[PDB]
Amino acid sequence: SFSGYLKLTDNVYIKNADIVEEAKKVKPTVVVNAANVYLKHGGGVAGALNKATNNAMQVESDDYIATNGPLKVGGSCVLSGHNLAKHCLHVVGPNVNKGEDIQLLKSAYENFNQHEVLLAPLLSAGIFGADPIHSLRVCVDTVRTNVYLAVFDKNLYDKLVSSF
């Protein structure tokens, strides 16, 4: 199970960790990917998770898009977790750097409520351009299931904990 996490609330936990290394260690039931609507896992968390699967996540994702079309911003899909987890929940948070409505971040986090426990990054943080402090606030106020947040950056992790 999950180790070294700081408990923020009854159901939200946080750790300064690389989500790829965390996933390879825990092999959780669900790892969340910070996906885009096209499931093009180029950079950030998505690029890192996909690289850890030796591109198997991208091959599976391209077949999913060919069949279903793009996801909605705020939406998700469950695909294989490959060598990282049983499943990967690909969740699309709004990308502020594309002018997407930050109000969609709550809808994005609501996808986590369909899973009893998840290993996840902060949605819309990093290259998605949102304020990670705001993302953590929306996470705590939206997710009711057990979410283990992995924050890659130590300095951001310390800021998130100290300002919580």
Swiss-Prot record:
Q: Catalytic activity annotated for this protein? A: Thiol-dependent hydrolysis of ester, thioester, amide, peptide and isopeptide bonds formed by the C-terminal Gly of ubiquitin (a 76-residue protein attached to proteins as an intracellular targeting signal)
Q: Which domain of life is it from?
A: Viruses
* Cell compartment(s), UniProt: Host endoplasmic reticulum membrane
Q: Which residues form the Macro domain?
A: 1-164
Q: How does it sit in the membrane?
A: Multi-pass membrane protein
Task: Describe activation and inhibition of this protein.
Answer: Inhibited in vitro by GRL-0617.
Q: What does this protein do?
A: Responsible for the cleavages located at the N-terminus of the replicase polyprotein. Participates together with nsp4 in the assembly of virally-induced cytoplasmic double-membrane vesicles necessary for viral replication. Antagonizes innate immune induction of type I interferon by blocking the phosphorylation, dimerization and subsequent nuclear translocation of host IRF3. Also prevents host NF-kappa-B signaling. In addition, PL-PRO possesses a deubiquitinating/deISGylating activity and processes both 'Lys-48'- and 'Lys-63'-linked polyubiquitin chains from cellular substrates.
Share what the entry says about its subunit structure, partners included: May form homohexamers. Interacts with N protein.
Query: What is the name listed in the Swiss-Prot or TrEMBL entry for this protein?
Result: Papain-like protease nsp3
Encoding gene per record: rep
